Design a protein around this ligand. Structure first.
Ligand SMILES: N#Cc1cc(Cl)cc(Oc2c(Cl)ccc(CNC(=O)c3[nH]cnc3Cl)c2F)c1
Ligand SMILES: [Mg+2]
Lengths: 404, 560
């Protein structure tokens, strides 16, 4: 096979990202895997004249260990290649299908050799414990899993592989994103599963083998901001409500509070009850209607990054919002049901998966957690083969209460 | 003289778009010129360098020095310019071994490699860039020109290429001797086995010989160092380790420099001597400073120092690591944001100790700090031992449970157990989930003028009270906290407070027990004394009753 030449975005050098410390268990697992990949020619040991590095991790995905390379940096620095030069167009139909199955096709890439002048940028290190040994250095000789360039390059081969199947099932949508195929149909679930098995057989002829089996995106609907319903309303309850309604108005146009504030006039004790006047009763009812419908004026812009915020609500509940401009929510949702970090990583993965399906992009996460805690623990429960961008924030205080 | 390894060379490049150095050789004394001719002549004989013509256009300055006590000359090459132009290499090591991570061995041998760098060849295509010139007596005739055949001292690539070369060389021996540990550090190898002395001293020789087959010379049985090994500020004995002796100076007048050097030594001692403190001594250094400027010790600083001397008066040692057993980590609060810890596998024989004394943010509490300390120790343990320890913490499971479930950040301590070692970690107050019936409701507010920095803080209450204090050189933030403080001062043991400051609410809802802000500390004092406090937020400038009135009241003279 002739290799596709790859050039970095002008002025950018390759990644120089340090390896996060690994437990013995994972180091040992990585050493087995890499020893075997070396024998098979997929990777080769490198010398110190290669100054690059990309972190590596071990995950379960099953009880078998899998190597997960964090190419987030290489991906940012090679964006012109995989997005503009060799972009994979994202089908709008995928999210409309009743069932979507996600298949791992990462092994496909290991039979295609990587441009020799690019290999150096895929350098990585297996560290040792207590800096006993210098630590084992490799680069890739073939398309590596986790690099967005790999599917960009394999795109032409994937099309040949899928051509018969597509031709025979023209109402099935197949989308490739990183190491995975997303396969959507409107069929009855048994028929759907049969066509998936059929697809597996096609793939098998080219040497290839927080979520249910399938995804059901047509059964994804919004989380309305919900206003409580009561017989008796205290000053506090109306205050709470007005605060909730107030913030809600920045997102939704038409939200009105005039009447509600009229009740609070004076310097009233918080516990004291205030019977609702008919105008207020009705103002409340009008807002209530507005919140059930979508946001007028808010549209996905492909030239912009997606952002995800998540809030811990207690009792295993987490809310989230995805937007490109603050308050211009494209999607909002809830995730439920361990410990906090486990739940959070589950939520992050589910939100990312929905994001791939809806837009063909992963969002940048604002995570309500301490950096080091996250960095220590996230790999223990991570099962995806991609990794989204993230940063760390302080959530508080009522952005929490304004949802759920 | 010495061998030069037949190991393959590492190909080396200049930074793309850069040519090699062409730095002008400055005229030298006859004395210096003569020394350099004798040195280089000898180095050429040994293979280390070679003569080249004037076709090679590259040059790097050369110097020579000889101390006034000595008669031996040394050559100094200034590779600054070549180093700019030489590619980046992979970093040598992520970290250095900690003694506490060493598994105990029956026998240990240290082997330093002689003339490490000069024993490794240099990429033939790159040698040209290492050119230098011994100049003529008064720079009249063309100088004598040389280039390096081996890794030069002071060149950017030598450390990395050496280590790389040592690794390749060691590989086969490792694969045939999996039981033997060999630590690589700089020119050194540290070699440990569980074999009996005889079979060890044999295996050392097989290694020394294997190393010699590849051009690397090492010391023999007679010249090999003996335990205790003194290494990087540590002492490594056969079944324990410690830090090298710490001399705590006595002084009438302490200079900044003396205190910096004291803190450093105490910090270094803290890895095995438990309970070391440096907070008060560090407080003295946070200022204009100046190395020779004497700083008088505060009473607290003197007491801290005295307590450390007591800790240090008798030697303490740590044990080595046994990978068949779990690690246990214990943490104690020492007060004033200071934490101390000990890690052992068998109580109470410590592998090592440490401290945590870090403010994360302006306002915090002991539960947050403890979690941070746990996180630091966990990372440290993964680095030193490749696994996390089981924890023993001075906090009830119930306190931890209440805190994590109600707090808004995700947080997770791995396997731990409560241990009753006071002071215990607790939360000192809690805010009500609901409005307090039969309690006065204070609507509070603050305002600050941006030009003048004058401010007003105040409240109105449902029982008809009001108050307004004036403030100078303040900010909006500060006035909002003052307002809350006022309401707490003038209220009974139960009170509902309504604010429009998300800033203040956020601080207070995290149940801080300590702050850099005096005002916040005063607010905390109050919150502890109260029986019940309910704190709520309303948006500002929406004419919400109670809020609109205190807003008019505190805006007067400050804002429209
Ligand atoms: N100098 C030095 C030095 C530095 C380091 Cl990091 C390690 C080192 O060797 C040791 C090795 Cl390779 C393993 C274990 C240890 C700990 N010491 C022993 O096991 C021991 N046994 C008999 N005498 C001693 Cl001392 C090493 F020091 C020696
Ligand atoms: Mg205000």
């Amino acid at each position: 096979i002739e290799t596709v030449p790859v050039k970095l975005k002008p002025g950018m050098d390759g990644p120089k990202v340090k390896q996060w410390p690994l437990t013995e268990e994972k180091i040992k697992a990585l050493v087995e895997i890499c020893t075997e990949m070396e024998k098979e020619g997929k990777i080769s040991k490198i010398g110190p004249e290669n100054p690059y590095n990309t972190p590596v991790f071990a995950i379960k995905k099953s009880t078998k260990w899998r190597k997960l390379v964090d190419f987030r940096e290489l991906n940012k620095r090679t964006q012109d290649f995989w997005e503009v030069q060799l972009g994979i167009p994202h089908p709008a139909g995928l999210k409309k299908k009743k069932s979507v199955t996600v298949l791992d096709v990462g092994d496909a890439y290991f039979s295609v050799p990587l441009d020799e002048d690019f290999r150096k940028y895929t350098a990585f290190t297996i560290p040792s414990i207590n800096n006993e040994t210098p630590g084992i250095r490799y680069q890739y000789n073939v398309l590596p899993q986790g690099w967005k360039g790999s599917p960009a390059i394999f795109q032409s081969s994937m099309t040949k592989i899928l051509e018969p199947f597509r031709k025979q099932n023209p109402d099935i949508v197949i989308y490739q994103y990183m190491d995975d195929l997303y396969v959507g149909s409107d069929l009855e679930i048994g028929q759907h599963r049969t066509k998936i098995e059929e697809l597996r057989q096609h793939l098998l002829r080219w040497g290839l083998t927080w979520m249910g089996y399938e995804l059901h995106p047509d059964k994804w609907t919004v989380q309305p901001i919900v206003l409580p319903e009561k017989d008796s309303w205290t000053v506090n309850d109306i205050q709470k409500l007005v605060g909730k309604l107030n913030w809600a108005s920045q997102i939704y146009p038409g939200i009105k509070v005039r009447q509600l504030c009229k009740l609070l006039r004076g310097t009233k004790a918080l516990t004291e009850v205030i019977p609702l006047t008919e105008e207020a009763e009705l103002e409340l009812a009008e807002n209530r209607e507005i919140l059930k419908e979508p946001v007028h004026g808010v549209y996905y812009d492909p030239s912009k990054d997606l952002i995800a915020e998540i809030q811990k609500q207690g009792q295993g509940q987490w809310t989230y919002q995805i937007y490109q401009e603050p308050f211009k929510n494209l999607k909002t949702g809830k995730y439920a049901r361990t410990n906090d970090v486990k739940q959070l990583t589950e939520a992050v993965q589910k939100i990312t998966t929905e994001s791939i399906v809806i837009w063909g992009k992963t969002p940048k996460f604002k995570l309500p957690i301490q950096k080091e805690t996250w960095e220590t623990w996230w790999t223990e429960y991570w099962q995806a083969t991609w990794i989204p961008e993230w940063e760390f924030v302080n959530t508080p205080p009522l952005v929490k209460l304004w949802y759920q | 003289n010495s061998p030069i390894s037949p190991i393959e060379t590492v190909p080396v490049k200049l930074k793309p778009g850069m040519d090699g150095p062409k730095v002008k050789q400055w005229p030298l004394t006859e004395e210096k010129i003569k020394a350099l001719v004798e040195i280089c002549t000898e180095m050429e004989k040994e293979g280390k360098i070679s003569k080249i013509g004037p076709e090679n256009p590259y040059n790097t300055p050369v110097f020579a020095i000889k101390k006034k006590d000595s008669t031996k000359w040394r050559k100094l090459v200034d590779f600054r310019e070549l180093n700019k132009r030489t590619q980046d290499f992979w970093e040598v090591q992520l970290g250095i071994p900690h003694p506490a991570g060493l598994k105990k061995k029956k026998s240990v041998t240290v082997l330093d490699v002689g003339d490490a760098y000069f024993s490794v060849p240099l990429d033939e295509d790159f040698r040209k860039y290492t050119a230098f010139t011994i100049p003529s007596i008064n720079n009249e005739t063309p100088g004598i020109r040389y280039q390096y055949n081996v890794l030069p001292q002071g060149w950017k690539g030598s450390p990395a290429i050496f280590q790389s070369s040592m690794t390749k060389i060691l590989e086969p021996f490792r694969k045939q001797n999996p039981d033997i540990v060999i630590y690589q550090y700089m020119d050194d190898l540290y070699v440990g086995s569980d074999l009996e002395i005889g079979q060890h001293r044999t295996k050392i020789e097989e290694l020394r010989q294997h190393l010699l087959r590849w051009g690397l010379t090492t010391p023999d049985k007679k010249h090999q160092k003996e335990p205790p090994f003194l290494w990087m500020g540590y002492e490594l004995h056969p079944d324990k380790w410690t830090v090298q002796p710490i001399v705590l100076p006595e002084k009438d007048s302490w200079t900044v420099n003396d205190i910096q050097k004291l803190v450093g030594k105490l910090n270094w001692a803290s890895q095995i001597y438990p309970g070391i403190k440096v907070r008060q001594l560090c407080k003295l250094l946070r200022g204009t400073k100046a190395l020779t400027e004497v700083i008088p010790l505060t009473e607290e600083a003197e007491l801290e120092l005295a307590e450390n001397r007591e800790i240090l008066k008798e030697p303490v040692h740590g044990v080595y690591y046994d990978p068949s057993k779990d690690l246990i980590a214990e943490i104690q609060k020492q007060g004033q944001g200071q934490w101390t810890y000990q890690i052992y596998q068998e109580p109470f024989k410590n592998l090592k100790t440490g401290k945590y004394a870090r403010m994360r943010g302006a306002h915090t509490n002991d539960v947050k700090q403890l979690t941070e300390a746990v996180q630091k120790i966990t990372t440290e343990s993964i680095v030193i031992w490749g696994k996390t320890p089981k924890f023993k913490l001075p906090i009830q499971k119930e306190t931890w449970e209440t805190w994590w479930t109600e707090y808004w950040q995700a947080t997770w301590i791995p396997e731990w157990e409560f241990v009753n070692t006071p002071p215990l970690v607790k939360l000192w107050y809690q805010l009500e989930k609901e409005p307090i019936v039969g309690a006065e409701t204070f609507y509070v507010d603050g305002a600050a003028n941006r030009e003048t920095k004058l401010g007003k803080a105040g409240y109105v209450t449902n029982r008809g009270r009001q108050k307004v204090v004036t403030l100078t050189d303040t900010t909006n933030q500060k006035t909002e906290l003052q307002a809350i403080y006022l309401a707490l001062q003038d209220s009974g043991l139960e009170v509902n407070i309504v604010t429009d400051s998300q800033y203040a609410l956020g601080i207070i809802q995290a149940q801080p027990d300590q702050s850099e802000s005096e005002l916040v500390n005063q607010i905390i004092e109050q919150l502890i004394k109260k029986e019940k406090v309910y704190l709520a937020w309303v948006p500002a400038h929406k004419g919400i009753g109670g809020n609109e009135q205190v807003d008019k009241l505190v805006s007067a003279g400050i804002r429209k």
